[PDB]
Structures are given as C-alpha cells and as structure tokens.
C-alpha cells in the first residue's frame, strides 16, 4: 500500500486540475521556490487522509478553496490513488481511489466513485494500520519542535497513547456496553426456546390424543419443529461458549495491561538509542522514566549525558527527530510525508538523515520536500513546484535540475 497518484483541483494554490505524475514506491522529493505551494501539496494529502482535517467548520472548509484571482472557486477536490497490491486496504482491488470533494456546503468522500462517510474513511485507514493514536505519518517542523520542547509528562502521555492506553480503554468500554446489550438478547433467546418447547409439548400430546383414535400442518411438521429446535440450541450453546471465551479474554487483557505498555516503552527506548547512534555515530541517547509522572531524554553527542533542556538548537531538533523515528520504527507505516524535517539541521546531520531515508525507502514510500541538497541524494524521483499567477503547478524534473535548483535558489534561509 502506497500513494500511487494524487490529483488536486481548486485546493489552496492548486486552482487548476493538477494530475501529479505517479509517485515512485520509494523516495519522492519535491523542491521549489519559497512560497511556491509545496506545503499546500502536503495539506492536500492531509486533507484526504489526516484526521485533524476530518471535521471542518463551513468557514474552515471555505478557506481551503482557491481564492487566487478571477472566477473565485466554489468547489475543490483531492484524490489519493493507492496502490493496494499487498492488499492492506480491505478492498479487493489492486488500485483504490479516495477522493474528498468540498463546496459551499458540500463535504463528501468518495471511495472508488461511491460515496462513503467520514467514519468509513477513518475505519478504512485504521484497518490498514493507520492508527489515529500515532501522530507521525506526517512530520513537519511543528511536530519536531513540539517533541523537542515538551514536558516530560507530555512525552509520557504521547507514548502511553501510542502504546494504546486510550484505544484500549475505549474499546474495553464499548465491548462492555455490547456485552450487556447482548446479555438481553440471550435472555429473549432463551425465553423463545422455552416457548417453543412449550408448543412441542402441546403438539406431542395432541399428536398422541389422535393416535388412540390444531391444523394438520403443525402436526405434520412436528418432527421438523423438534429438529429445528435443536439446531437453535446448538447455536445458543455456541453463544455460551463464546461468552466464556470473552470473559477469559477480557480478564487476560486486563491482567497484561501494564506489561503490554511496558514492552512498548522498552521498544521505543531501544529504538531511540539505535536511531540516534546511527544518526550521530559515536553518540548515546536513551529515554528516562521520571518521578508514573513523565518521560525524559538524555543524550551525549560524544560519556556524560546532558538533558534536552540544556541542548543546542539544531541538536534538540535532531534528537526529537530521532525519537520520532524510533516511534515510527516501533509502529511502522507503508508511506511517510516529510515536510522539511531537515530544516533546522546542520549539513552533516541532514546528510545522516538522508542516509537513513535511503535504507527506509527500501521498505516504505516517502514523499518529502527540502530546500537543502542532502536529501536529494536519497531520492528516487524528483518533482518541482512552480508558482505563477498565484497558481501552483507541479511537474517531474530530473535529479540534476533538482540539485541545480536547490543549490542556487536564494528564496529560503
């Protein structure tokens, strides 16, 4: 499962029908002048796939329409076409298309041209592994800083939720509510089997009263009704077995609640050390559990580790990013969107992040932007955004155009 193609129309700067050339299953990198509409390109994808765009007030919906110049736009859509070869989307198609259309008072999703609800789209992506509990299928500078400058309690809340504490408690509560509702259906079921048994007793003894010598149909089908009743019983017994299996399951899940969470934390921390040592060769990083109350970071770019508070600029950014990478490697995803995650990094550290994407892109798709040429080295296919008449366009370029453009562009930092 990866993003095979994107089509945008009327969305922010993308006034005209922009049929983006189909992405490589590996690393796609987008370059272009500052303010030419690159971040708009990621917003268009997040508009379809990201849950933070799922609820849009009518004023928010309208602010996504193109208001660039002439005939002010009244409708927009974005379409993701997924490759579904590994059948990760529960849809028996090789290609799945997901379009969201907005207008003055329209906000409609379409799955292979058929209308579906927002919950459908959420459940569709949840069952493909895209957890609303994981905020890092898209990474921007906003997220890296939010991580780097977060209270240790916030780090804890985030890792708890990714481990699944909120999901679990929510599914546990909905399950209970379902069990008790089912518990009423089981009683009504046993009532009806008692009533049926009643009539089988009435029937049998009218049947006997006539043999010494009520429609004949009931008497004709007496053995049929008795056979049917046992088929119902066997299914009723299947429910009783299932009730017992559920009780065990609920009990066992509750009893492994913490060692589950503790195993997700031990994994993220183990990954945080591995990710960082690979980005800063000859460095040491690790998570720390506090007063639980919080989760902190300790790191040494050198044997004496300092904290996140007293850390440099483009080092706090690199460490935070290294943590995000660790959580990602711990709850992986088929494709990733990086909007200028190399922005605050030294040339050396951008080169290391580039080297990491090189290997990751062997097993997941990446769609990234940058204004610095390190990440261009790890790329497989190149796109340039051009902006003229307040209208964004996007076109495939060669690697040399991408490297040349990035080198002597002056528009960024």
């Amino acid at each position: 499962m990866y993003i095979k193609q994107v089509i945008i129309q009327g969305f922010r700067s993308y006034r005209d029908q922009t049929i983006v050339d189909p992405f490589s299953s590996k690393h796609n990198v987008i370059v272009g002048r500052n303010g030419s509409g690159k971040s708009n390109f990621f917003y268009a994808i997040q508009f379809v796939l990201s849950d933070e765009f799922s609820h849009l007030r009518p004023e928010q919906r309208l602010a996504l329409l193109h208001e660039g110049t002439g005939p002010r736009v009244i409708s927009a859509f974005v379409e993701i076409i997924f490759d579904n070869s590994d059948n990760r989307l529960p849809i028996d198609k090789e290609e799945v298309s997901l379009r969201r259309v907005i207008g003055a008072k329209k906000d409609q999703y379409f799955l292979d041209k058929k209308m579906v609800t927002k919950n459908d789209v959420m459940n569709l992506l949840e069952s493909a592994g895209f957890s609303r509990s994981n905020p890092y299928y898209i990474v921007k500078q906003g997220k890296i800083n939010q991580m780097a400058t977060a209270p240790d309690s916030q780090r804890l809340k985030l890792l708890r939720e990714v481990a699944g504490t909120r999901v679990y408690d929510e599914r546990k509560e909905e399950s209970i509510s379902l069990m008790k509702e089912t518990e009423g259906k089981r009683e009504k079921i046993n009532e009806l089997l008692k009533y049926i048994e009643e009539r089988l007793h009435t029937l049998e003894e009218e049947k006997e009263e006539l043999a010494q010598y009520v429609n004949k149909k009931a008497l004709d089908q007496f053995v049929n009704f008795s056979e049917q009743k046992e088929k119902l019983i066997k299914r009723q017994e299947e429910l009783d077995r299932g009730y017992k299996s559920i009780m065990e399951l609920m009990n066992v899940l509750e009893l492994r609640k913490y060692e589950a969470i503790q195993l997700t934390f031990k994994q993220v921390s183990k990954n945080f050390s591995e990710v960082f040592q690979k980005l800063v060769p000859g460095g040491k990083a690790t998570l720390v559990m506090k007063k639980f109350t919080g989760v902190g970071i300790r790191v040494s770019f050198t044997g004496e580790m300092r904290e996140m508070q007293q850390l440099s600029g483009g080092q706090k950014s690199l460490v935070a990013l290294a943590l995000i990478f660790a959580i990602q490697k711990c709850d992986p995803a088929p494709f990733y969107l990086f909007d200028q995650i190399d922005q605050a990094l030294d040339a050396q550290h951008r080169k290391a992040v580039s080297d990491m994407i090189m290997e990751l892109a062997v097993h997941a798709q990446f769609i990234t932007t940058t204004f610095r040429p390190e990440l261009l080295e790890s790329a497989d296919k190149f796109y340039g955004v051009k902006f003229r008449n307040k209208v964004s366009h996007i076109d495939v370029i060669t690697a040399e155009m991408a490297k040349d453009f990035v080198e002597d562009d002056t528009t960024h930092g």
């Binding site: 529960p90 949840e126 481990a163 089908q221 399951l249």
Partner: protein, 87 residues
Amino acid sequence: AHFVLSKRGPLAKIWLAAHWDKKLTKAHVFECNLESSVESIISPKVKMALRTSGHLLLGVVRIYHRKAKYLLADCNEAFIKIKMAFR
C-alpha cells in the same frame, strides 16, 4: 507488535469486525469461531501491543453480538412459524 500479518489470516475477520464491521457479512459472523479467535489473541506468536489487543477485543465482542442478533431473529421466526402452523 502493532500490525501483525497484513491479515487474511486467523484474526483477519476479527480485525475487520474491530474497524469496518459494515463489510462483515452474515457468512463471516456465522463461520467465525469465537474460541479459537480468543485463543490466538491470548497467546499469539509475537506479543502484540495494548492498542492491537484492544481493537481485537472489540472485534471478538462485535462478532459475538452479531451471532446473538441472528439467533434472536431466527428464534422469533421459528416461534412464529409454529404458532402459524397450528392454524
């Protein structure tokens, strides 16, 4: 630890019940064996994350609720059929 198997395996229909039960059919619900489903959750090949077990729990309970729904419907229809055959 989180997305085990890409599904179409043993817990496949459970995972589907947990997310998009719209696409879960009466044939699925009937042929789902709740006790071997629970068995492969309480002791899987790889330990699975609290998030994954939480979904699957709802998967199992949702299929179980649909079995009851059908059994109830069928019992009401069998009881009506007998009352009708009397007349």
